[PDB]
DNA sequence: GCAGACACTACGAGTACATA
DNA sequence: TTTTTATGTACTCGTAGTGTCTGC
């Protein structure tokens, strides 16, 4: 019931999406931002044996970085979370699950309207250039028959007219023309190769990132234009 | 403030005495509106206890943990008897800039900071 | 029939909170503009305000979002700071609801003054996200909502019905409270209790329900319980005669009879003298009783200050 | 009847633990015993201008009789960030033990915390499932009306005449038990009766006077003289106004300023027989006016002197 | 014929004017804008009116659209100091290959503690005003530091002359007609729209909204007219019973407002100040303020509120 | 006769250390000796509107005759954040040699201290086991009645 | 007198207990809390010459943080403290010894009623867990033979019911039962090893921390219980 | 094998508000 | 023709010091 450092690294990522988390027993974890903005699901290497809801996941792991990694976690008779160390013990209070906005069931992502496949280092460079060019919102669309991502500076761009980047990704074999806008603040996924699934029907839409262990559903923007 | 300004002019004092009594918990817009039809005539007029004494008075008050009234009397009796100059030196260490600037910011708390310096 | 029990709530007035807009008790025109919004499928910017508490605002807000089936964001206004507006609310308004349900933000209890910088930022916030998202505001001090923000919303004044609406709202609240007692097993021995509870706590329906719980301790709304609502602590009788004949010997020895029942007795005294004295001696009664009531508390001898009222009454009112 | 030990200060050493041990008006206890009967505690505001009535004790006893996850909070420390922080932090914590959480906010009637109050508006409706809030106040109009709506407003220190008689009798038997546990011998039992009546609704100062009046170690008839004090008659006072003198009634006020309520409560009664009929209405108008302001009056002795001067003028006497 | 933003649903912005000629302004101001657009480059302009919804942000956007300008719209509340030095300068120093005038609209700029960012903007207008111009829309003009008004062309909205008001309301009565034509609202009585425009005038955003709230039936019959002309109430029943010295209704309305005493006493003072004579203004605030002073000291709060009603009836000389 | 020889003002230098040394009327001298005899001190508001009667000396004399761990502070410097910080850190902790802990608030009837006064009700009850409070009052009405509930109102008799 | 790095750091620690310090001739420095809850003492390697009282010890160390390590701290011929640098020279005004509340009474600790030792990294983990877990009071008792330190949330937890942290520090030998509660606030020792000495008899008691250089004697909270 | 740079906190300033 | 007094609270902003993370 100890938590490996890659699992906790994934947990500290989920804390960026939602300040809390509701995790039941098993190997599957998930969370969704309160403002329905992002949703992450992932199966991991450790096994949770008991349902527990954590009101402050950020502070939980920040405290869990103070005991040795061999720390045995458990549900104490003190009905909270017991962090047994070599000498010390941390009784982190379990929270009432009603106070943690969490997906009551995993979001079954619909059939993708368009499929591409971002690379991990391509995603890495995209974050580096955004922090340098103040890129706040990006758009994934078609350019000369290929699926590309284009970032803007919605602060200075407003209308989103002046392109500031173009990560040419895959090729598009369909006939549809789409302009899906994602907010960079909702790019809460950890770096890693992702199969990008796009869906949009009418005035709805969402993007899914299938990972080697962690999946992420990030929301599209109000101005996303498509012909699906 | 607005009541305390009309507190200098005694002809405006009947309405100021009322707002002192019952004007508590009365609307700001109502407060100006009451004083509109309440003050007699207009033609706005003039205006509405020194530094080097008021540092000693407030310094003796903090030392002996006494009030203004008691502190004021302390100095007045010490000016007459056993060397107030001696107790001035006893209190040269606790004249911090936070103490000083608290009374008369402007530019005096620097001509007062090193005013009571020369007391040894 | 339609009444919603939250079950997960133990505190009554939150268990029986209305779920749909029809279950709300509203003036006909106000219910007519809420059903109109639901039938339009789209929600505008709205401010639900009232100086009286618990008129329906927070519930009608949630109820309007339910009937629309809205991706709603319930937010405590006191906790909605400018950075929270710059942040998750702007990141919420710019979403695109994965199931297409129109987004709504509910800023609950937003009449606060410290969050003025949030409202100043909210002026151009609502205008920038009129598609996708809209804001329902629950306030108690409308003037706490800055007139620009008031302009951007539809301002619906709760707890202030026309007389023809007030009658139909109490009538519904009585039939409601009757169904509440059925759910809760409270015996309505005297229906005039329910009417008194509704009439006395109008238009704070939350306090009406809370009063029902306070007085359903015995589980039966008997006639003695009505005498607790109206706090009908009997008649006065002996004082009225002892004034009508100016009997000071009795009046001064009769003042201790109501020293521990002052607030009720002063109310009952004015209530009975109103019908038992000449028309312009009514105004002299409220002039000296209202004063005597106003100075109770700061009165040294509360018994003597009641005898002061007796000797002043007997010497100035002429009984019709 | 439950000693606290630990403390040394009687009134705090004998504070009731259960609501049944609490002495308070009949209907209040029945509403209290009904709340504990339900097993769950609503939002309650226990208030009374008169201090030492049991409001705090009832709150701590209400959580005790229910086995609540009580978190006691000095309301003067219940700032908005403190509501945002420890209050939510505690209300959002899981109650796997089945205990209901109750935030007890003692002395929460302050005016500067209105912004903290206005946050609790939706806080209480949000966590109303298992958390509840007992508010204890003296000035109940310092609680914003949207919170009095959310709470059960139980007013202390406002008993019926029948409750006063039984509550005094319940405080008599309690006090003599305090003396048994404390080692104070009771000779003249009427002392304990005058100790309860002199400070009736304030049961705290009631015990505070017991400790103060046990200085002899016994409650003899001399202690009862110390409790009902001056009395006698308003003789010299009555011939002061009867002579319409100068300095004699002016310097007579401090002896009767302390027991002002009783003094006026016997001055008008003694004078009623010997001051004509058309001035019996003028004397009660003057005395009543001077009586109802005894509170806004800062110098009780000067207030009495002001009553004497205007009495010496407008009284016809004989 | 009216510009619609067919993704708005909210009326009050679905039909927001696009150009100056679509706006409803006083003739001189409307002419002064058409001439400012004709001259090519926009000056530094402060658009202000304390009464909201008069045309500020619309005209600010309409000037940028008429000129076809590379407009940078910004919420004046997020216009902090690191913003004026940051994305504002980055935009002002961008290359205008397009030739269109760079204009920065700072919407809702008048704010409390933005003083340092405000003076920075003034000093910014001595450096980059060569390239770009700035349109400010504010409610309180004073919230704007004096150096900015000294530089900017201050056009005061919502303060029209009588003849300008008459024509503006008539134009607005035709706008709401063209709104009702395009939305699907039946205008059964034309005096509805006239009373709609007139009741809440200078705020054009609010009067369009009021039309939306009164469109709940789909038709503007005379019943809706009776609604708009119904002057509502707040505490109209107490004011009415106070003018009539009706002791019966004062006796029955005191238990109506003893619940929220502190609000009612404040609302009562606000209403009587307009309805009562000036020599009575003295006795008014004295009677009320004293009654509120003893509020809570009075044992019976309901009777104490009736005491206020009796005291006012006897002492108020009415209008 | 107690002298604080390090003092420069005769008012502060010849301040009685014992309640016996205080020049006080009968009944009072009997009262205070009875209070010090108990060995434990309850909350005391001793007050006299006449200046120079001995309000401050008696408040300190009771702390000495009972061998108290006294913390004497003037009311004016006794604000609410002063009560939250130091005054609480004092009354919460138990002194190393035992002995009564006392907090004397001199001239606490000052008007601006109304809200910090309102903090003490519950403060005094939470730490009544370890520490008591003596209040020196000039105007007794300046003390909120909930504090008089918790204190013994000693008025210096004629 | 010369002030080295280890001694100024100690004065930076003693400043936290008392805004100033009184130090007389020798190598022994000592300060007590104004309310009388935390007493600190330290024998040092730097020897001071005269007797001096500093009212603003915090500001005194800040002004000293510009002079080179050769800092000559001397008495002024009138009385003040001049600070001679390699080049510059500063003048600081000294204060009267009665302005700074001095401990004055270094009466030795009695007999240790209980003895254990807390490690440097164990105090470190206690202070770092409390920073993340909001622990305001700690109680030292016995559990299953070994003695432990338990941390609570006195505000969030009235009578110290639910533990939030527990650190074991070795086993107890004698057959005694106790629970000394210490306030975390009035606990101002610097990082390092401290042989924990605990004395308490009847209703009085204290906790002494014996560091390799300095000693810290804090007071125990009144709620503490023991059978000594 | 640490620097850099973003990320976080604290604090002075200024602001607005409610009391006596 | 003038320009200021106390206490307590909550919020925003700016900047500056400190903390955690990363390079061709
Ligand atoms: N208009 C109403 N119709 C029906 N019930 C109401 C209404 N107003 C209040 N209530 C009662 O009070 C509670 C709702 O209070 P709420 O409207 O949330 O308070 P506020 O309006 O002050 O935000 C519900 O549980 C309900 O029982
Ligand atoms: N109703 C009561 N029944 C029994 N004892 C009481 C009652 N009211 C006060 N007391 C005594 O006074 C103390 C409680 O005062 P408390 O209720 O805390 O004051 P407040 O009501 O102002 O908070 C207890 O120690 C108790 O001995
Ligand atoms: N002068 C006007 N002419 C036409 N419509 C207007 C005018 N002023 C406001 N409106 C209406 O109000 C909305 C714009 O309000 P606006 O004036 O931009 O806000 P503010 O005046 O508060 O900056 C638009 O949807 C428009 O329909
Ligand atoms: N009863 C007394 N016995 C002896 N000395 C007194 C007495 N009352 C006052 N004094 C002298 O007056 C000085 C100040 O008294 P203080 O306690 O300040 O009285 P108050 O606080 O009422 O002004 C003391 O130094 C003391 O020497
Ligand atoms: Mg609400
Ligand atoms: Mg209490
Ligand atoms: Mg605008
Ligand atoms: Mg004194």
XYZ file of C-alpha atoms and ligand atoms in Angstrom, chain C residues 127 152, chain E residues 12-13 15-17 23-24 53-58 108 175 204-205 208, ligand 3:
47
model
C -20.051 41.022 -21.640
C -26.269 43.767 -17.087
C -29.124 42.945 -24.730
C -25.959 42.009 -26.644
C -28.263 43.461 -31.145
C -25.237 45.484 -30.136
C -24.477 48.137 -32.788
C -25.503 53.750 -32.467
C -28.014 56.073 -30.806
C -25.455 51.283 -20.746
C -25.366 54.567 -22.665
C -23.096 53.486 -25.529
C -19.536 53.624 -24.180
C -18.163 50.146 -24.903
C -20.242 49.912 -28.092
C -13.932 49.709 -17.460
C -34.912 50.029 -32.307
C -29.936 51.495 -23.289
C -28.713 48.087 -22.105
C -33.504 46.282 -24.010
N -26.233 54.357 -27.816
C -26.703 53.097 -27.982
N -27.340 52.739 -29.118
C -27.814 51.493 -29.298
N -27.701 50.509 -28.389
C -27.087 50.725 -27.201
C -26.540 52.065 -26.930
N -25.990 52.014 -25.702
C -26.164 50.754 -25.230
N -26.814 49.985 -26.121
C -27.156 48.561 -25.894
O -26.416 48.152 -24.742
C -25.412 47.194 -25.077
C -24.032 47.817 -24.949
O -23.810 48.482 -23.712
P -22.523 49.440 -23.625
O -22.961 50.863 -23.871
O -21.446 48.838 -24.496
O -22.087 49.290 -22.085
P -21.500 50.543 -21.265
O -22.275 51.718 -21.810
O -21.847 50.200 -19.838
O -20.018 50.559 -21.564
C -25.608 46.794 -26.526
O -26.038 45.433 -26.621
C -26.669 47.727 -27.067
O -27.750 46.969 -27.614
